[PDB]
Design an enzyme around this catalytic site. Sequence first.
Site, PDB file in Angstrom:
ATOM      1  N   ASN B 101      -8.511  82.923 -20.125  1.00  0.00           N
ATOM      2  CA  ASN B 101      -9.459  83.743 -19.699  1.00  0.00           C
ATOM      3  C   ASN B 101      -9.890  83.444 -18.399  1.00  0.00           C
ATOM      4  O   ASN B 101      -9.760  84.092 -17.364  1.00  0.00           O
ATOM      5  CB  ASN B 101     -10.483  83.684 -20.727  1.00  0.00           C
ATOM      6  CG  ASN B 101     -11.595  84.893 -20.565  1.00  0.00           C
ATOM      7  OD1 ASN B 101     -11.697  85.506 -19.225  1.00  0.00           O
ATOM      8  ND2 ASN B 101     -12.650  85.206 -21.216  1.00  0.00           N
ATOM      9  N   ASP B 200      -8.492  87.826 -16.285  1.00  0.00           N
ATOM     10  CA  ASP B 200      -8.277  87.642 -17.787  1.00  0.00           C
ATOM     11  C   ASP B 200      -7.237  88.548 -18.313  1.00  0.00           C
ATOM     12  O   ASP B 200      -7.527  89.289 -18.546  1.00  0.00           O
ATOM     13  CB  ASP B 200      -9.773  87.909 -18.468  1.00  0.00           C
ATOM     14  CG  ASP B 200      -9.515  87.883 -19.917  1.00  0.00           C
ATOM     15  OD1 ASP B 200      -8.707  87.178 -20.234  1.00  0.00           O
ATOM     16  OD2 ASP B 200     -10.706  88.186 -20.272  1.00  0.00           O
ATOM     17  N   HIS B 356      -5.824  97.696 -17.472  1.00  0.00           N
ATOM     18  CA  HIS B 356      -4.739  96.679 -17.104  1.00  0.00           C
ATOM     19  C   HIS B 356      -3.377  97.457 -17.268  1.00  0.00           C
ATOM     20  O   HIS B 356      -3.152  98.087 -18.168  1.00  0.00           O
ATOM     21  CB  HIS B 356      -4.808  95.354 -18.015  1.00  0.00           C
ATOM     22  CG  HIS B 356      -5.735  94.536 -17.353  1.00  0.00           C
ATOM     23  ND1 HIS B 356      -5.426  93.749 -16.373  1.00  0.00           N
ATOM     24  CD2 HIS B 356      -7.009  93.776 -18.157  1.00  0.00           C
ATOM     25  CE1 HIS B 356      -6.400  92.924 -16.166  1.00  0.00           C
ATOM     26  NE2 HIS B 356      -7.175  93.077 -17.105  1.00  0.00           N
ATOM     27  N   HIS B 390      -7.296  94.080 -12.548  1.00  0.00           N
ATOM     28  CA  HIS B 390      -8.111  94.003 -11.440  1.00  0.00           C
ATOM     29  C   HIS B 390      -7.064  93.640 -10.298  1.00  0.00           C
ATOM     30  O   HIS B 390      -6.878  92.565  -9.626  1.00  0.00           O
ATOM     31  CB  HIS B 390      -8.925  92.773 -11.281  1.00  0.00           C
ATOM     32  CG  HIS B 390     -10.056  92.758 -12.627  1.00  0.00           C
ATOM     33  ND1 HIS B 390     -11.221  93.624 -12.428  1.00  0.00           N
ATOM     34  CD2 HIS B 390     -10.057  92.267 -13.642  1.00  0.00           C
ATOM     35  CE1 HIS B 390     -11.693  93.338 -13.580  1.00  0.00           C
ATOM     36  NE2 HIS B 390     -11.170  92.486 -14.407  1.00  0.00           N
ATOM     37  N   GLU B 415      -9.181  87.293  -7.749  1.00  0.00           N
ATOM     38  CA  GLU B 415     -10.139  86.829  -8.736  1.00  0.00           C
ATOM     39  C   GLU B 415     -10.113  85.247  -8.558  1.00  0.00           C
ATOM     40  O   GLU B 415      -8.859  84.635  -8.777  1.00  0.00           O
ATOM     41  CB  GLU B 415      -9.854  87.486  -9.900  1.00  0.00           C
ATOM     42  CG  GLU B 415     -10.564  86.669 -11.193  1.00  0.00           C
ATOM     43  CD  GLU B 415     -10.738  87.656 -12.204  1.00  0.00           C
ATOM     44  OE1 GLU B 415     -10.343  88.892 -12.204  1.00  0.00           O
ATOM     45  OE2 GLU B 415     -11.375  87.234 -13.416  1.00  0.00           O
ATOM     46  N   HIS B 417     -12.017  83.401 -10.714  1.00  0.00           N
ATOM     47  CA  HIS B 417     -13.085  83.066 -11.654  1.00  0.00           C
ATOM     48  C   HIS B 417     -13.322  81.636 -12.111  1.00  0.00           C
ATOM     49  O   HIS B 417     -14.219  81.256 -12.575  1.00  0.00           O
ATOM     50  CB  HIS B 417     -12.855  83.734 -13.068  1.00  0.00           C
ATOM     51  CG  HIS B 417     -13.946  83.930 -13.993  1.00  0.00           C
ATOM     52  ND1 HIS B 417     -15.267  83.515 -13.906  1.00  0.00           N
ATOM     53  CD2 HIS B 417     -14.046  84.755 -15.019  1.00  0.00           C
ATOM     54  CE1 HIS B 417     -16.041  83.812 -14.733  1.00  0.00           C
ATOM     55  NE2 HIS B 417     -15.294  84.455 -15.668  1.00  0.00           N
ATOM     56  N   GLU B 460     -15.081  89.114 -10.076  1.00  0.00           N
ATOM     57  CA  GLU B 460     -15.336  87.789 -10.285  1.00  0.00           C
ATOM     58  C   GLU B 460     -15.049  86.816  -9.508  1.00  0.00           C
ATOM     59  O   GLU B 460     -14.340  85.659  -9.643  1.00  0.00           O
ATOM     60  CB  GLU B 460     -15.099  87.433 -11.680  1.00  0.00           C
ATOM     61  CG  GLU B 460     -15.683  88.587 -12.745  1.00  0.00           C
ATOM     62  CD  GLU B 460     -15.283  87.955 -14.258  1.00  0.00           C
ATOM     63  OE1 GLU B 460     -14.276  88.508 -14.639  1.00  0.00           O
ATOM     64  OE2 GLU B 460     -16.376  87.437 -15.036  1.00  0.00           O
ATOM     65  N   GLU B 536     -18.020  97.068 -15.510  1.00  0.00           N
ATOM     66  CA  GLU B 536     -17.643  96.678 -16.922  1.00  0.00           C
ATOM     67  C   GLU B 536     -18.917  96.578 -17.822  1.00  0.00           C
ATOM     68  O   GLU B 536     -19.961  96.369 -17.839  1.00  0.00           O
ATOM     69  CB  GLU B 536     -17.030  95.387 -17.147  1.00  0.00           C
ATOM     70  CG  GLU B 536     -15.963  95.277 -16.064  1.00  0.00           C
ATOM     71  CD  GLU B 536     -15.397  93.715 -16.238  1.00  0.00           C
ATOM     72  OE1 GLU B 536     -15.561  93.149 -17.322  1.00  0.00           O
ATOM     73  OE2 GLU B 536     -14.486  93.362 -15.382  1.00  0.00           O
ATOM     74  N   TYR B 537     -18.504  97.353 -19.065  1.00  0.00           N
ATOM     75  CA  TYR B 537     -19.691  97.682 -20.042  1.00  0.00           C
ATOM     76  C   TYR B 537     -18.964  97.832 -21.458  1.00  0.00           C
ATOM     77  O   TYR B 537     -17.807  98.347 -21.807  1.00  0.00           O
ATOM     78  CB  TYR B 537     -20.753  98.509 -19.698  1.00  0.00           C
ATOM     79  CG  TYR B 537     -20.285  99.917 -20.319  1.00  0.00           C
ATOM     80  CD1 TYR B 537     -19.643 100.770 -19.482  1.00  0.00           C
ATOM     81  CD2 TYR B 537     -20.948 100.853 -21.002  1.00  0.00           C
ATOM     82  CE1 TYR B 537     -19.324 102.131 -19.772  1.00  0.00           C
ATOM     83  CE2 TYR B 537     -20.797 102.065 -21.118  1.00  0.00           C
ATOM     84  CZ  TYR B 537     -19.963 102.698 -20.635  1.00  0.00           C
ATOM     85  OH  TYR B 537     -19.514 103.948 -20.835  1.00  0.00           O
ATOM     86  N   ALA B 538     -19.767  97.695 -22.581  1.00  0.00           N
ATOM     87  CA  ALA B 538     -19.533  98.278 -24.002  1.00  0.00           C
ATOM     88  C   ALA B 538     -18.107  97.404 -24.345  1.00  0.00           C
ATOM     89  O   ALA B 538     -17.073  98.051 -24.525  1.00  0.00           O
ATOM     90  CB  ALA B 538     -19.196  99.807 -24.362  1.00  0.00           C
ATOM     91  N   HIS B 539     -17.942  96.221 -24.495  1.00  0.00           N
ATOM     92  CA  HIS B 539     -16.937  95.337 -24.563  1.00  0.00           C
ATOM     93  C   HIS B 539     -16.131  95.587 -25.737  1.00  0.00           C
ATOM     94  O   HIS B 539     -16.865  95.382 -26.899  1.00  0.00           O
ATOM     95  CB  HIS B 539     -17.256  93.955 -24.474  1.00  0.00           C
ATOM     96  CG  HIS B 539     -16.003  92.977 -24.332  1.00  0.00           C
ATOM     97  ND1 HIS B 539     -15.439  92.276 -25.491  1.00  0.00           N
ATOM     98  CD2 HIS B 539     -15.490  92.399 -23.204  1.00  0.00           C
ATOM     99  CE1 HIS B 539     -14.517  91.441 -24.986  1.00  0.00           C
ATOM    100  NE2 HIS B 539     -14.570  91.580 -23.552  1.00  0.00           N
ATOM    101  N   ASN B 596      -5.574  78.074 -24.580  1.00  0.00           N
ATOM    102  CA  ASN B 596      -5.451  79.451 -24.723  1.00  0.00           C
ATOM    103  C   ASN B 596      -6.778  79.931 -25.092  1.00  0.00           C
ATOM    104  O   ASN B 596      -7.698  79.311 -25.258  1.00  0.00           O
ATOM    105  CB  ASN B 596      -4.355  79.957 -25.460  1.00  0.00           C
ATOM    106  CG  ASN B 596      -4.411  79.723 -26.820  1.00  0.00           C
ATOM    107  OD1 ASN B 596      -5.348  80.379 -27.569  1.00  0.00           O
ATOM    108  ND2 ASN B 596      -4.116  78.744 -27.687  1.00  0.00           N
ATOM    109  N   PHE B 600      -9.226  86.942 -27.413  1.00  0.00           N
ATOM    110  CA  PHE B 600      -9.810  87.708 -26.223  1.00  0.00           C
ATOM    111  C   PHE B 600      -9.293  88.432 -25.307  1.00  0.00           C
ATOM    112  O   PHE B 600      -9.681  89.102 -24.626  1.00  0.00           O
ATOM    113  CB  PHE B 600     -10.763  86.704 -25.452  1.00  0.00           C
ATOM    114  CG  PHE B 600     -12.135  86.046 -26.157  1.00  0.00           C
ATOM    115  CD1 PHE B 600     -13.250  87.055 -25.820  1.00  0.00           C
ATOM    116  CD2 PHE B 600     -12.225  85.210 -27.050  1.00  0.00           C
ATOM    117  CE1 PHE B 600     -14.462  86.711 -26.262  1.00  0.00           C
ATOM    118  CE2 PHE B 600     -13.460  84.737 -27.556  1.00  0.00           C
ATOM    119  CZ  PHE B 600     -14.557  85.763 -27.322  1.00  0.00           C
ATOM    120  N   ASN B 603      -9.179  93.450 -26.028  1.00  0.00           N
ATOM    121  CA  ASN B 603     -10.384  94.289 -25.990  1.00  0.00           C
ATOM    122  C   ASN B 603     -10.414  95.620 -25.732  1.00  0.00           C
ATOM    123  O   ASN B 603     -11.321  96.418 -25.334  1.00  0.00           O
ATOM    124  CB  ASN B 603     -11.321  93.631 -24.852  1.00  0.00           C
ATOM    125  CG  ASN B 603     -11.056  92.283 -24.546  1.00  0.00           C
ATOM    126  OD1 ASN B 603     -10.793  91.708 -23.583  1.00  0.00           O
ATOM    127  ND2 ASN B 603     -11.273  91.465 -25.587  1.00  0.00           N
TER     128      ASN B 603
HETATM  129 NA    NA Z   1     -10.375  89.580 -22.469  1.00  0.00          NA
END
Ligand code: NA
EC number: 3.2.1.23
Lengths: 1021, 1021
Positions: B101, B200, B356, B390, B415, B417, B460, B536-539, B596, B600, B603
């Site tokens: 991630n 991610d 993605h 992204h 990115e 991150h 990020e 980004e919202y509401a994962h 790993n 995750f 999503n």
């Molecule tokens: Na993810």
Amino acid sequence: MITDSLAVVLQRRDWENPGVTQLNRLAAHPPFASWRNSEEARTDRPSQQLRSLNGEWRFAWFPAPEAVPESWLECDLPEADTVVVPSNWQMHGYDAPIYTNVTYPITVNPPFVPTENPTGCYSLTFNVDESWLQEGQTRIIFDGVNSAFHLWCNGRWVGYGQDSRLPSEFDLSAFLRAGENRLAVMVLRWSDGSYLEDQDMWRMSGIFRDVSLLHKPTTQISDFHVATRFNDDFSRAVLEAEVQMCGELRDYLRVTVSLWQGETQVASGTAPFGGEIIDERGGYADRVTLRLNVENPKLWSAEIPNLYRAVVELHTADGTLIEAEACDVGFREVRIENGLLLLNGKPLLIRGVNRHEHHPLHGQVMDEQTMVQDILLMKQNNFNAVRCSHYPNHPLWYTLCDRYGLYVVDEANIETHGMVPMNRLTDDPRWLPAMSERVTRMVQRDRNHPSVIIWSLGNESGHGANHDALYRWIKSVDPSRPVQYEGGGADTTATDIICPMYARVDEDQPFPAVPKWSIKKWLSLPGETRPLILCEYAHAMGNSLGGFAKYWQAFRQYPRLQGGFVWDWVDQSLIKYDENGNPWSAYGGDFGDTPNDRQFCMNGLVFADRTPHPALTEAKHQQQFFQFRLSGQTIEVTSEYLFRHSDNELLHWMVALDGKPLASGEVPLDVAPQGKQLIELPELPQPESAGQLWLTVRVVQPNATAWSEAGHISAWQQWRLAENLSVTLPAASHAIPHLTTSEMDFCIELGNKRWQFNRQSGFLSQMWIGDKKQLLTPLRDQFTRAPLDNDIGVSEATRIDPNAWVERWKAAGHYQAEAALLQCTADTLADAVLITTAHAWQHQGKTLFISRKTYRIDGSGQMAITVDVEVASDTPHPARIGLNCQLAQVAERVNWLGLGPQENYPDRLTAACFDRWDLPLSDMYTPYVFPSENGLRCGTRELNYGPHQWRGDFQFNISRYSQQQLMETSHRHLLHAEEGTWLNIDGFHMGIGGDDSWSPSVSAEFQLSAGRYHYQLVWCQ
Amino acid sequence: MITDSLAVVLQRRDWENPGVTQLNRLAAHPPFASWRNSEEARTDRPSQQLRSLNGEWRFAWFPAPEAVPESWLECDLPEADTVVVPSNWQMHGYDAPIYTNVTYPITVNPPFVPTENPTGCYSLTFNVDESWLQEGQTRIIFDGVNSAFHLWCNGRWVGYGQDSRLPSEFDLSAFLRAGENRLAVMVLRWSDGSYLEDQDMWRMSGIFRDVSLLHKPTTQISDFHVATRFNDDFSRAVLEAEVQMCGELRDYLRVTVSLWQGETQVASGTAPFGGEIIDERGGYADRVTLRLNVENPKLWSAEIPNLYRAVVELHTADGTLIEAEACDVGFREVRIENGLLLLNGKPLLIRGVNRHEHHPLHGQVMDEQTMVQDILLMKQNNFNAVRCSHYPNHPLWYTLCDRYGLYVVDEANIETHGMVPMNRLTDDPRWLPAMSERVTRMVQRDRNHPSVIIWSLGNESGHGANHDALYRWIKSVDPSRPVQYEGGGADTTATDIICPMYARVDEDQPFPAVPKWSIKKWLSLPGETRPLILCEYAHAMGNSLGGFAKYWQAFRQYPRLQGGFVWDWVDQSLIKYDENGNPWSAYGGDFGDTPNDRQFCMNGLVFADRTPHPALTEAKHQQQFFQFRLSGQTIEVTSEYLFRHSDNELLHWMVALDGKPLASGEVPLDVAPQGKQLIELPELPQPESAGQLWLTVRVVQPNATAWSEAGHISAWQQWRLAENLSVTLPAASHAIPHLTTSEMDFCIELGNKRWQFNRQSGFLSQMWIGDKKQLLTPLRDQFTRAPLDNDIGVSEATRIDPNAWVERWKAAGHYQAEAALLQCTADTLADAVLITTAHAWQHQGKTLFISRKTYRIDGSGQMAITVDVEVASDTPHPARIGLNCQLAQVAERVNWLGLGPQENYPDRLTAACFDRWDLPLSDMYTPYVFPSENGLRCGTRELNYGPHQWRGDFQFNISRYSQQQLMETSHRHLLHAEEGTWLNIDGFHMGIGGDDSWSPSVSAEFQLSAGRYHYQLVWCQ
Ligand code: NA
Ligand SMILES: [Mg+2]
Ligand SMILES: [Mg+2]
Ligand code: NA
Ligand code: NA
Ligand code: NA
């Protein structure tokens, strides 16, 4: 190794690729010395960890990189010479320097450069102590290499570099061996970096700045930043120091920052590594920020350059020192508020000049002595700011500016003037990396210097998106300094200051898409609020700086007109030797360089040897920090200092009647910054004798400074007091001049004196004192002058510019006009002989001028001449209206009552003062490298030379060189003194101009446009 | 050649150097096809000048670049396989894909990468026609290579490239030969570009996008830009087209730009080359700008994607065509005014999702069919915008978005991150060139697409000066689109839009230096004026999207809250096969990849095969373009369309009494954009029978569109009408249940029915219908659920997160609590048998819950259960409060009266409607790849399964899998159906949360915090 060979290294042709601007080059950073003793760091003593490699190197010149033999990588070439480093190899005669103004010296085909690319192969054999290789990091630092280079160490390829004007550093730790080591540097004259280096200057090459080795410990200080914040009244300051490290972090590591004012420690702080949280992932574990409070700090300014010493210590918790670094600290705040540029809360007035790094013998290699000489000369002539045109300077320059006090504009090494359009590269994203390196590395190197108050993005590169990007990058990284840039019309989104070049005071120049509005009009354009500071103005090419006073009147009247930078400081002339080893100053084209831009390289206020031009005095007077006003008997002195009291100033006044002193005195100056002081003069003398009373004041510095000697004059002003007109009748002599009339001439005799007027030419052809002839050439009207650089502009025999003054004069026939006699009559009066003449000057049937004269020779021997001239309204206005002759006398000194002592012209005479002046004849000739009209003195009421005296109200110059010789001679060393002395006496003379040197710049009020002119002279012995 | 050998090419290690991001790569540009026929260009027919090299290639895998033999440059390796290109070589089993991630998959030591760097050697043998090599330019285009590569052609080195997500083009004109040619591409998994590619997502590599050859003439179109300007009312537009050329300029050259609306030419213009003056040096001689007026243009929007066709012709003056290029044109204006993002003058409401590029079989290789499937699914679920998270997408994606209508945020491939701090690279000027390439080449490629309305600087990466520089570069080059960036706290100087990730509606999250304020509070911070659009919202991780309705209520209430982008569209699961060739969906760690980030990677709103999750219906309902309000008998329909009338909408209403229809009708919708329509219902039925009257409305599209079928439902809403409470007494049966009391249990018998209550456990242990047992497990209280992904968060056995709900429940002993019997009594009433029980659930001496029940079995056979539960105030609030049992019955269908048809939870039930639903048992289980609590249906008044019926007011789920098995099973394919059927009937159930999946996100109003709970059930047959 095959990969270390020239055949492999040169194959990628890294110098024809803007995507590769370096290979294996270390990060930029402020100056480092790696002191291992904090006291040595504080006192700025030389560091044993920093070792200069300057000295004798081996050098071999090649016409192209492909011509270098492979064996050069292993051993020194047998044909290699021994040369001094730093140097420019054009200064050793290996190939010619090239002077071009805007046109690129190579074929414009980016990113490609010519195959015949001159290549300089440098090499050095040196020893390294075993202690440096046992532990730590050893790096080599090339302070400047023009224009690109590959580096080998002991035969192994190390790296590559571009940007000739910033240091390039390489880690040599894995390449060096104990004992004997060899360095091999291949320098290329042309690269893709050359497309960003199109400055108006000589094009040279080589390792022209210092080379040194620096040894650092493995755990080391890698960067440090110094920032100062203040309260509203500047009585409290916070010194914020951010320190960065490389190497293994350990919990016992500490950083101490101490601030020193001379020998006294003012503040200190110690902290372990680890910065504050900045984002979701945390903070910098390899950085620390220390904040030191300073109460009542001594603020830095050009007036008072107060400096502190900050020492940055890297040490363990027990107390052993790992490394120390230091820098001078100047507490000052720079910001633009409400349209005004402020320094420490006060609006600046920039008395600036542009300065290239130039030496007539060493090319573009700079030394501390020349730097100090320049700084002292600038400060002594009331300059307070310098623009680094157009590149980062030698690092010592900023230290000296910190120490002596001068505001500095630091400029990135980006100029693409020759491109079509000018922003072809700067608007291309593929050149953004190369441009960004040149901006960012300059900021990283110089951001700690207090003298640097403004960043510049470069010069004359149009306006592209890369400019906006880099402007914003600077604003983000260093908010403490404004950013300026002139390209694209001088008011784009990429500049915080309107910074035009050669915008005029009152006249608009509305060019398409990039107009140069008058500076007064520019401020008030709808929606415009920024300050205006000319990045270049008052082009000082030759006999120039006409109209400078207009600029400074405007600067003082308008708050948002905060000054400018004169172009420029020093002539870019080079020294050559003729067949007798005699040096002479050379300009463009004198080295076989072609195409070239001839004498446009010489635009300075001082000669290349730093002797002043006459225009420097005009600049000094206009830029003086004390302004004066007279009201009856009181003098009002206004201070233009912003921070300092007048604690080293004494005012001297003098009253003279037509040059002879009558009264004088001294009054100490006590005036606050931006304050006033009223000085009441005593009851001044009131002589009943005829003549004009003149009051002269001068400000004197009784005490020497760091930049001036005791008794230095910093300002002056003159006024006319009461005048008594002469009503005394002339002494009625009893002798009567005798007229003899032949068919050839009129002969007037009085005692031992004789005058002869040729009746076929209509001019006074000879004059006798006893049996000695006084004239070598008859007295004749003159309407022309040997053209100035401002008269010529860009015109030349190949490309005629019809708008230039010299071309208009030539086309109108002013230089070839033939005088036609209209009348010549002699009459005998009761006590004098009267001669009346009339001439017409014609060219191809057009009457250009008519001159009507009267010669009245009385019984006292005086010859009174009245001249009335008519000028055709449709011919271009003449350069002068006067008389000239070649005297047989050669006298040693010249004495006159008028403006002086230095040469002055109608639009450049504000600095001159009316008085009795006496100079040797040689001082009456200004030796401009390109000969022209020179040495004029205006406002003259009396002139004495040998037995002769002329009186009236006129301008004159006197020299051994005729206007014809000056016009036809291209270099001053080719001038030869003619027999006798040439005298030019002018009733009227045109201004010299100088707002720019490529278009007519003489303002209307200084052109001879009246159509009719009258003047009178009295010639006596 | 030695210089073409691997030993020489690999020696500089260009993939460990951020200063070299490419070698010999051509400039970026919009898509080109080099049509030689203008009609073909206009109709977008395939070009013979553009040739696809997709297909079978030779491939060889190596563990490091140093392992590749030199002979690979000359001939194909004998061990080489044949593979399909494009592809990711991890999808062929050559090495494992890695899912991490935030942590980099390699040791963090920039710019260095591990020595064991997996290397993929591609090669292709292909023919080239002699016409292409006789004249013109032949270039190869790699649409995407992950992550860096060297290129050879016929054994000669050509170039190098980075940035896996943008095309890399190389001139092959000097390398190709007539007949047989060979291509050799060495792809490296890791490079210094990988430090800028820490998204991610699965980490793959290879030539994963198309490869093609393009032939251009020597004189060619090299770039063209399209811009649209409008008047105030958009009734007049000016189409400005700037065209750039390369090659030899000739005076006969012309450029014609024609605009087409279908088959009709709307505008045209022709001009010779040569632009307007832009600076002192002139203008661009190799550019021309053509301005075409369009009257009443058809504007582009996601609602109505009107498109024009612009054709750019390069031709001579006589009329022969040299080259043609074309692009689709959408007339639309995007701007932020007074804090609102406007499209064509109207404020947008972004119904967005992050997407993605992922395929469960082909990895990150995209195809047109998958793209179209995604676009149709998004539009059918009321999405109007997509964020390219992204990185720049496959070029066909923007064309399809232009055609179908979706707003696009185009994001740079940056990115970082995993860096510490997150801006360590983005604040370093040495990485500015690499970052700038990734921004500028994306803009140059995609600036002509109408669907792209916003640029993004990446994801990020903290906030550094490079972000500000690139923000300003974009603002300078393309002022027509806003720029956004979330890093550094989502409101920095580098963004035009406040774009936070997972900021909550009402709750503040005040993290140090990067707080996530509640979105309502963020708008009103002092000095803040920009719009807010969550990037980004509401994962949507697993059983998620609790609280989505809160976001959309806020979006509709606040003007400057203009929507957001859900994270995210599709699960990033990959397909593996067990020992029987049976596929199963795999997540992080299933390929031996370590470390790993397990599940995750999933999503999405849809499974990897694009089948929907239940949360998609909630999103569709909340995002619907028609809003409804009921007032008595009238329905107020409000349109949320900005541009289109409701010309394809029919409103259907239905009235039902406890599920049985009573009345229905249809009313055509005629509502203007942002208008209202009042719909008067007829006199609705008023039944005297007991029950709740429900009104349901649905909007139906009678006609098919480009993106939907005929009869597609786009919006719906339900209301409660009048209710008649039941006051009818139950039928007084004459039979009396008989109680038999033994020391083991109470036995109640009535007819053929029997109930058994174990007296030692206190629970109903068995139930008989005739001689058939009905229960496999006794009926017992349940207070826990198999934890959701939102319950688990980032907690794992190695790193326990004490704040996660599952960890709090485990620590409190909820999953291990043992029931202790307090009382169990049986009483016989006049017409019923009464059982009273009380239990205490205890863990380590602490009483967590107490349950007190009453069972009343009457003469009608019904068993009425009343439950009263007390929850200790200091224990964490339980996930549910209900009963569960294992039925022996396995029935085929489930029938219930309540909210449905899909699964719904207390904070995710707005999309569900109350009605009678009947589904197969399999549809009552949601197959989340990571098993958890699933399939709940809330608001249920009646449930039928086999012979059993339960009534009351409860939530339930019913499946073949116990909560224990779901909790202990990590993959859905490992689940096995248990004997019988597990039933969970809940009086109360906790919300599922979903504002983010790494911290508790269930809002207080959906937690079971009341302390005392009561519910009743009736069990009958
Ligand atoms: Na993810
Ligand atoms: Mg290069
Ligand atoms: Mg690289
Ligand atoms: Na001013
Ligand atoms: Na010049
Ligand atoms: Na809103």
